[model samples]
Target: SHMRAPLDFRGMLRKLFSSHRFQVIIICLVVLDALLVLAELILDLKIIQPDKNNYAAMVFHYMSITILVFFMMEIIFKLFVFRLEFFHHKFEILDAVVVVVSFILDIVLLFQEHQFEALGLLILLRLWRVARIINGIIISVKTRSER
Candidate 1:
């Protein structure tokens, strides 16, 4: 049973990475992660104020920037090194959605009076980007092991 377990995991990993759909999903997650980081940056710059709203904005801004920079570097590295084909993938669609949504939210926050409320949900959604990264890493490791 113990030996069989590892074999099972190996089989699953092989299947996961071999599927075109899985790769697309991974790409989408990466893009979503980037979008969330961008959203946090916009929120910090435009919404959160040091004088008016304590240090919540400043803290989150810094945190978001850190996360954004990390992911940006990762994506760039993956682009040059891994160079995975991403065209015509469903995950690509999700990535586009996240990016467009982040941009729209940024604009709305800039123009609308009740922008703070929007920030609340945006911040929460941003957490998923971190999860996405974790999932991507797991998928990558599984892919490597399968090989």
Candidate 2:
């Protein structure tokens, strides 16, 4: 009885990938990450010198935006996918708290002129996002096995 029913497979996969709100959030994150990576890579290549001033600020701003979007999307997905029971899930709460703390840290760095410190934290946040991808894989595998 702990296993998912066959009928739940399509629904779960659809909920995972076909939700328009999630799609939009994923697209925005991907585009922003790509842009940041491109800027850093090109600057490293000497195609353009990196701006010495506010480079950390720029990165912090992007990371802040990313954390905000990630939190919002997590909330939306909880509502849409898990309904009211979302509040009962510990991992969901952890996801939200991590993003919120990251966002707050970004704000603090913005004011203190210590953006480099926030970069390390943001990298940790990005790693957490990767963990979510692993969760997705596990969900898919569970659904298929249930079938």
* Best model number under lDDT: 2
lDDT of 1 by residue, 25-134 (tens): 46675578567657757875784453432245444544554555466445434432243473446764675578556645644553456544544534544456555656
- Which whole-number lDDT from 0 to 100 does residue 80 have in model 1? 25
- Candidate-wise lDDT, in order: 0.53, 0.58
Q: After superposition, how far is residue 43 of candidate 1 from its true place, in Å?
A: 15
Q: Candidate 2, residue 93: CA error in Å? A: 1.7
Instruction: Give the TM-score (vs. native) of candidate 2.
Output: 0.47
Off by over 4 Å in 1: 1-70, 79-88, 142-147
Clashing pairs in 2: none
lDDT of 2 by residue, 1-147 (tens): 547556457556656664545556556656766786678667657835324425655665575557546655754443243345435577767776877787667556645554346555555666566546545644754685666
Q: Candidate 1: give its CA RMSD in angstroms.
A: 13.9
